[model samples]
Target: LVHVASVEKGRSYEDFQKVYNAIALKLREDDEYDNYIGYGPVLVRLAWHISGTWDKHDNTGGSYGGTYRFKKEFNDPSNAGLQNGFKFLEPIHKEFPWISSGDLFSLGGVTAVQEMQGPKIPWRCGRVDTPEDTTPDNGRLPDADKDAGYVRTFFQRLNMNDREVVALMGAHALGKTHLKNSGYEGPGGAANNVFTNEFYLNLLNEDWKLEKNDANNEQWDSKSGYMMLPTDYSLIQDPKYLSIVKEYANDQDKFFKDFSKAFEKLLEDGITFPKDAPSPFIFKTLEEQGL
Candidate 1:
């Protein structure tokens, strides 16, 4: 099966920019949610969950299909907390009814990251909706209880390499994992809403201990009150991942550039773009425009 990039009949960068502006304003307006961290983290997670379903071997599930709108995909346990992101995006979809779900979702993430002071992720606009039956199985997403080896193997299906894996996991820097939704809890660093190399810094600098939470799940806890999911801790446990983690923890600019490339690739996976497809859009953040 082949999915081609198809821009919405009459839409272009400006139309998508308008959509981006809407999401960015609402993100500022809705400041009370998630203990004041706002909807940014969950929006990024939603975009990732929607895109992470891809299988490099068969290309059955991906951001290209927009199948996360379906019940089965929505209710996946791995995506439990992400409904907030979908709910946040519901109004954006209402305002721009012509945009495809995949495009809206992927764009939400790019907007969140950039608005939050992250790098510019160049995003394409051509993911058409697939049928209900096209949704992928639930377990394709990675598990939090796993180690470095598991994290390494899991991302293979999505065709991500080691550097990509380490950089992508940097998103864990935002939004504390809720115990009710994910069996994990606590913020990653001092600034939960800002995008940074803090996840790597905390992973490397903290005096971490293996402890069980009220949810009876084991996680790495620091005296400073931050927590690292087992999969997150795995970066330090694996030498190969550790090297990249140290580099990212040391160099902010490099991490920003690498994350931008890796994230754009993650969202763009499993789609075939034609030579005439429009160039990926680089949206201006509301702050950048003095809005």
Candidate 2:
């Protein structure tokens, strides 16, 4: 159950940089997706969802398996809208066929984050794909309809503390909840593509009312045309989560740093890196490289 890191033969930072640049370029070129919010949001979600399956107790699922490429994981109802992110990466995968599915999927997230102006998430490659039988069953991912206690308990299975959970949910700042995909409608905030503390800001400041979507699911709705799943709203409902939410909302730099650490840990879950393994690689954002 402990998947160890193993670098691809003769590959180094520059090779992955090429993969990063490919993802970044496609992110720029594919501006038409998601109403101009681009593929960045879904790519981030894709990465998280793929890794979110990890059960620290048994190590049954995690980013290390790359089993999402299999039919069972791909067809999970919970993954309704992620096919767009997967298809977007298809060409990139074809171009860089040498990379494993797990590495490409996780790296897509790292590339999307930096390309969309989020923090530089240090990434390490080496995720070998397992067989179809290795894929975890559906329902491991968190439920949006759940409560604060449910949120805490659910994340505990993944070994995330309240701070890490709060920081990770800040990613809600990136994408909208599609009515068709999640049965919840509307964006989390105005800057849906930009990675900011806006999710926390919106959660803390917005005047939200509990409402039922057309699907009869409960979600918090704001007059600003934004909505939060019950689980997202749980952050503000719980005292400890609320405190961290306020802290993140009050300080962008702190949110970025904490988010970077938590996201890296999330992606690296269930994997043991060797002592002699290469250090984590931080790729330059397209903006930094003037691309």
Candidate 3:
């Protein structure tokens, strides 16, 4: 399945900037969610979840499909709690009705990251929506209960190396797992809405205990009310992943840079952008523009 990019007609960088601003503005104003952490974290999660479905081997199940709009993908067991992000974007979509579903969904995550002071994720506008049949089967996303070996093997399908895999998982800094949504519960850190190396720091520093949640799922819990999925904890348990985790924890700028690249790659997977299509857009953060 070679998914080619279809540039949105008459759209340019400014149009997407407007969309980014709208998302940023709402993220600042909508501070009531998740104990005032705002919708930014979940928005990034929504973006990741949508793109995480890609299978590099067959070129199926990626951000290009935008199949999450369908009930089958939206209702996937792994997608619980993501509807909040979708609902948050409803008004934005209504205001900018011309954008494709894949673009909107991918851009939402980019906007959320920048708004939350994460790295600037350069985004391309092209992913077109496909029919519901294009939606990938459930269980393509990684399982939370898995180990380091499982994490490594799972990412191979997405063409992510060890560094890319660890860098991408660093996104756990932004959000929590809801027991109802994912059997795992609790935020990964104190600053759940901020994109930092906190996820790695917590994993390396926290005194974690293996415990079963009310849902009978095992998660690594800390005294500070944080948690890590077995896949997350697998980082430190594996020597290779642990080295990257330590490097990220020691240097925030390096983590941000690597994360920015890996994340942009993750979102753009499986799409064949035209040679003449515009280059990736690097949106200005609200702080950078002093908005």
Candidate 4:
């Protein structure tokens, strides 16, 4: 059963902004992982995994219950190297001990994409923590080696449509496939750190050679030292997904607008917001505030 605060006590916008600042500052400082890909991509992935557990039927697993703090939840096989993301946020949580895990994790993702030059995702706060026993089981995340049909079906369980799935997968353009992390290797685009539609362009233009990575797993590659998993390559090969990929690649504004909406919905999955609850908040970046 969900718990509702009788008096409606939740974190203030001021307090939430402070938490955002904490995450933003740390991301700037921790720019040394996965060949200096930094904390941005992992934080986005962390938020994705936490929210991906939402199964529309039971309403049991979703972003509302911040259970990733538990050991059992942390060790989920699908979560592989996300421990790095969690460890990245450990000190932040220690600093702001009052913030709920759901809020912090969700906000970390929101901050990451914006800082990386994506879109301004509207956000809200009301998620409360649940017991460790409430954590969902593994295999909830999408398989890196899967095909389009499998990917389509997997996302449907989360209430995502074909368009939304395409937008979310474009996030793959932001992060790389770590050999050790997902048994795959290399990034999908040149501007991996900076958000752009380079993913769709590369998919259409690159001469990809299907080969094994250092991890001995099959991935598509080019002479540019970048790679894409079979699943990533599947986007352009399919006619429906290919059209949207081109749309995003050709129009920056359209991609940013669509991505922001889909990403925010992904983070907020399965939660029932009250009619009077505040609409999503758009936060200003540290650079915007001259901090």
Model 2 clash pairs are none
Cα TM-score per model = 0.99, 0.98, 0.98, 0.95
Model 2 CA lDDT for position 174: 81
> For each candidate, how many residue pairs have backbone atoms clashing (under 3 Å)?
0, 0, 0, 0
User: In candidate 3, what are the lDDT values of residues 1-291, reduced to their tens digit?
Assistant: 798998999999999999999899988899999888899888888998999999988899889989999998999988999999999999999999999998999999999888888888999999888998888889898787889999999898889999999999988987778778887788899888878899989998999999988999999899999998888899999999999999999999999999999999999999999899999999998787799
Worst 10 residues of 2 by lDDT: 1-10
2 against 3, candidate with superior lDDT: 2
A best-first ranking of the candidates according to their TM-score comes to 1, 2, 3, 4
Give the C-alpha miss distance for residue 150 in model 2, angstroms. 0.5
Ranking by lDDT: 1, 2, 3, 4
- What is the C-alpha lDDT profile of model 4 across 67-160, one tens digit per residue? 8888877888888888988888889999988878888888899999989988899988878888888988876777877677787889888999
Scored by lDDT, model 1 comes in at 0.92
Error of 1 at 39 (Å): 0.3
What ranges in model 3 sit over 4 Å off?
none
lDDT of 2 by residue, 1-291 (tens): 779888888899999999999999999999999788999999999999999999998888999989999999999999999999999999998999899999999999999888878888999998888899999999998788889999889889888999999999999988798889988888889998888899999999999999999988988999999999999999988999999999999999999999999999999999999989999999988777889
User: Which of 1 and 4 is the better model by lDDT?
Assistant: 1
lDDT of 1 at 35: 84
